[PDB]
């Protein structure tokens, strides 16, 4: 049995309606009842029972919780939005032998869009001494998640190169930090003159280059 | 009901590796113990299970030939051994109980399985200068194994728009991950601002100081 | 019905199913009242070379 | 799409592993399958299709050759490789427009080291009658190819003047040879006395130097 | 499914060159055509493919301005034009027919086109007489052009221990490669050593004498 799980990406701001819906290739319904299980999972945490069968929530759930539906479809609803709510819900099946997990919801709270601020750091000169170039590309407190990173080496988009490294949500602040690392040897950073970050957001009306020459 | 595993072991390719789950709060002859994988940041993939009062072992098709699940009653503890480690099996391995007619109802914190070809390497840290409102700063630590790498500023003096971000593993099968603050422009005059890095599996303690 | 399929495409023989054998070689209808039997026949099918 | 073939230039032993990597900058995958192919040429003939896709293989290809990978990473594997594998394999895609090529790998087969039987030439009189004067150092049976030829006309190092030919491994010796030619005119071959030809090689505790006197 | 092509193109840099490509076996029609570039001894670059049925040609951005191919269904073969040759032009093309979702799927033997200012010229020999266990001795071929040449020793009595290197190709744009052997040195004095040189583009057939 194959779980897809319709989205897998929500933002919902506090108090608002969250709906995961979770389509099973065939029946999980035997013996009358529902095999339609619904996990949670705190980062830094395992997984806990939320729903076990469709509708009965497992032990220690908040009445927020709630699962429905029968057969091959399934949703669950959480309406009084908290803060602890923050977390990846999966649904898995129990009607036959191999247990099958769905793709996972990441669940997080909604803001308002808020435009990136992009920084440039130039690799350390100590660096430099070890054959080595880092340049970073860095964007703080910028919603939503969707950030298009683009390097520009003496106006050459570079592709292969480039490592992003993404920090959860914030606890208060709720605003991404992203951070993009571009590795060259010294000898090929030393190469070329100036080096150029392209950013491209929502928040933004245009994408936003920030650049520096090498020294 | 409370299950304890163990902590995050480390081996080469082609290996084995034996992990242990402690039941704890029930009888343990009443349960069967299913035991479920998790790439980190993945979905899950249930590995299978075993019953402890019959030695009746069910295991996932693409587990039967790696996976190996025993059970010992006497101490309350069931064991799982995986053979011929490959770095498709990096991961986070769960250990459950059987409750409330779901296959992994109870689960136990979480066993981190990392398989490498690298050894314990130390971490080499790189200022990354502000450049000539909120000006920016940070350090960078590259090449070092295996995570992680406890990093804070002035020794926990400056907490306030301090990003840490998640190591990444590069190509060459090591770790890296920037630490990075906000500041105020007037402040690179006269604040001294440190970088303290460490890294227990490497021993090292390591602060840089970071200016325009 | 009667064919020959890869070992791992063995999981796409079933109702609701994805991939390249269930979306374009032999799909399944959803109400489906009958059976699949499927064995393994790597010492007739499969040839030197 | 650039293509970096690891290792380029291979020597195992037979009947071991084999293995030849291809890292892609952007994804060759399209349409669910794979466009990594590769290719082997033995010198002398065409390049032949050994596995077109990941790992569905080309017509006539031993079950020894294996290919393995996705996204941008993959890998060519020969286990048990015999004697006829000695080629230059190449990895290529066929993802996007413009068909690119790896950079190629020689497969070579790997022996015990071998110190080199070192000789060295005067260039023949008839040709000094003709004006010129090739001086030849060679080096007969020598595994592997990594081999330092330095020229010392008088205790002094020759530069831009050396040419050196690599011949193609032996059958069955299978151990490489070489010769360096210094070319000179006659006016500055008769203005030195003693001609020498020193040879660094790793089967060697020391390098060995050959020297003629002129005459 | 067998190609033909020409063989050995001889051209002096500024001109253009034309090479054919005769399909075998198929319908010539339902597969595209491609070219593929190849210096000797080096990587491979993908010159540009044509559609025989319709005559849409796709080139590479560094070959685009001095490729052209066109194709003739009624012969069914291809034909790759080249302009303004430079050294850089000198190399092995291939034409291959497209299969197996790969762009050159069956190639070609191979067109080896030469871009070189230089004329036929014939070898001047020099016998690399041993030095005054096993001697060492052999020949030397010079200022030759175009390759190859015949390297052969007493008529093939000699087959041992024999070493013919490849040519290097001067900066005057001629080609020298020396052909080497270790001997018994019981044979230095009564046993006669002769090389045989044979350069069939300038039909140059010459015997040489190696005496210690």
């Known amino acids: 049995i194959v779980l897809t799980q319709s989205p897998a990406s929500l933002a919902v701001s506090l108090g608002q309606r969250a709906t995961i819906s979770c389509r099973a290739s065939?029946?999980?319904?035997?013996?009358?009842?529902?095999?339609m299980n619904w996990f949670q999972q705190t980062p830094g945490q395992p997984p806990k029972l939320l729903i076990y069968?469709?509708?009965n929530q497992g032990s220690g759930v908040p009445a927020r919780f709630s699962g429905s539906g029968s057969g091959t479809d399934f949703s669950l609803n959480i309406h009084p939005m908290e803060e602890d709510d923050t977390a990846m819900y999966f649904c898995?099946?129990?009607?036959?032998?191999?247990?099958?997990f769905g793709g996972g919801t990441k669940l997080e709270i909604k803001r308002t869009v808020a435009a990136p601020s992009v920084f440039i750091f130039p690799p350390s000169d100590e660096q430099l001494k070890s054959g080595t170039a880092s340049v970073v590309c860095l964007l703080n407190n910028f919603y939503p998640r969707e950030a298009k990173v683009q390097w520009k080496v003496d106006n050459a988009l570079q592709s292969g190169n480039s490592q992003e490294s993404v920090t959860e949500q914030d606890s208060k602040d709720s605003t991404y930090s992203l951070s993009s690392t571009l590795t060259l040897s010294k000898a090929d950073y030393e190469k070329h003159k100036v080096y150029a970050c392209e950013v491209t957001h929502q928040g933004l009306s245009s994408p936003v280059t920030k650049s520096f020459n090498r020294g | 009901v409370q299950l304890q595993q163990s902590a995050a072991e480390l081996a080469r390719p082609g290996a084995s590796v034996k992990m242990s789950c402690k039941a704890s709060?029930?009888?343990?002859?009443?349960?069967?113990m299913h035991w479920v994988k998790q790439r980190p940041g993945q979905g899950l993939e249930w590995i299978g299970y075993?019953?402890?009062?019959?030695?009746?072992?069910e295991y996932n098709q693409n587990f039967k030939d790696k996976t190996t699940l025993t059970a010992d009653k006497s101490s309350s503890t069931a064991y799982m051994q995986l053979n011929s480690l490959t770095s498709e099996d990096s991961a986070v391995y769960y250990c459950?109980?059987?409750?409330?007619?779901?296959?992994?109802?109870?689960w136990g914190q979480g066993t981190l399985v990392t398989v490498s070809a690298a050894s314990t390497k130390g971490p080499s840290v790189f200022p990354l200068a502000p450049s000539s409102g909120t000006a920016a700063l940070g350090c960078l630590v590259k090449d070092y194994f295996p995570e992680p790498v406890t990093v804070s500023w002035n020794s926990g003096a400056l907490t306030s728009g301090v990003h840490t971000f998640p190591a990444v593993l590069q190509s060459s099968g090591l770790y890296s991950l920037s630490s990075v603050v906000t500041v105020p422009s007037s402040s690179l005059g006269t604040q001294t601002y440190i970088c303290n890095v460490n890294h227990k599996p490497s021993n090292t303690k390591v602060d840089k100081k970071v200016e325009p | 019905d009667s064919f020959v399929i890869r070992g791992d495409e063995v999981r796409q023989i079933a109702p609701g199913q994805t991939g390249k054998i269930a979306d374009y070689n032999y799909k399944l209808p959803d109400d489906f009242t009958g059976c699949v039997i499927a064995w393994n026949s790597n010492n007739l099918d499969s040839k030197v070379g | 799409i650039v293509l970096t073939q690891s290792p380029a230039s291979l020597a195992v032993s037979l009947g071991q592993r084999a293995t030849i990597s291809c890292?892609?900058?952007?994804?060759?995958?399209?349409?669910?399958?794979?466009?990594?192919?590769?290719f082997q040429q033995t010198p002398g003939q065409p390049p032949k299709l050994?596995?077109?896709?990941?790992?569905?293989?080309?017509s006539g290809v031993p079950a020894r050759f294996s290919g393995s990978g996705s996204g941008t990473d993959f890998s060519l594997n020969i286990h048990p490789m015999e004697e006829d594998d000695t080629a230059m394999?190449?990895?290529?895609?066929?993802?996007?427009?413009?068909?690119?090529?790896?950079?190629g790998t020689k497969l070579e087969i790997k022996r015990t080291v071998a110190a080199p039987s070192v000789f060295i030439f005067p260039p023949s009189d008839e040709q000094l009658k003709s004006g010129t004067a090739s001086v030849v150092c060679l080096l007969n049976n020598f595994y592997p190819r990594e081999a330092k030829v330095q020229w010392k006309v008088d205790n002094a190092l020759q530069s831009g003047n050396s040419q050196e030919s690599v011949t193609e491994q032996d059958s069955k010796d299978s151990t490489y040879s070489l010769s360096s030619t210094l070319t000179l005119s006659k006016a500055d071959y008769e203005k030195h006395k003693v001609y020498a030809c020193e040879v660094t090689h790793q089967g060697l505790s020391s390098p060995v130097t050959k020297s003629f006197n002129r005459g | 499914v067998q190609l033909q092509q020409s063989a050995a193109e001889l051209a002096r840099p500024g001109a253009s060159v034309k090479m054919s490509c005769?399909?075998?076996?198929?319908?010539?029609?339902?597969?595209?055509?491609?070219?593929v570039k190849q210096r000797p001894g080096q990587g491979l670059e993908w010159?540009?493919?044509?559609?025989?049925?319709?005559?849409?040609?796709?080139?590479?951005q560094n070959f685009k301005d001095k490729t052209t191919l066109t194709a003739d269904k009624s012969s069914s073969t291809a034909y790759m034009q080249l302009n303004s040759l430079t050294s850089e032009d000198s190399a092995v093309?291939?034409?291959?027919?497209?299969?197996?979702?790969?762009?050159?799927?069956?190639?070609?033997?191979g067109t080896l086109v030469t871009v070189s200012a230089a004329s036929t010229k014939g070898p001047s020999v020099f016998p690399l007489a041993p030095s005054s266990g096993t001697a060492a001795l052999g020949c030397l071929v010079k200022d030759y052009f175009p390759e190859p040449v015949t390297v052969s020793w007493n008529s093939g009595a000699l087959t041992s221990g024999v070493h013919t290197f490849p040519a290097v190709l001067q900066s005057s744009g001629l080609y020298s490669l020396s052909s080497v052997v270790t001997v018994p040195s019981s044979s230095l004095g009564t046993q006669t050593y002769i090389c045989n040189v044979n350069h069939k583009p300038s039909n140059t057939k010459v015997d040489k004498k190696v005496e210690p």
């Open positions: 898995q099946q129990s009607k036959e032998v191999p247990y099958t």
């Open positions: 069968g469709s509708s």
């Open positions: 459950a109980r059987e409750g409330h007619r779901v296959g992994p109802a109870y």
């Open positions: 065939e029946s999980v319904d035997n013996y009358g009842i529902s095999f």
């Open positions: 075993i019953n402890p009062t019959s030695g009746y072992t």
């Open positions: 709060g029930y009888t343990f002859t009443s349960y069967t």
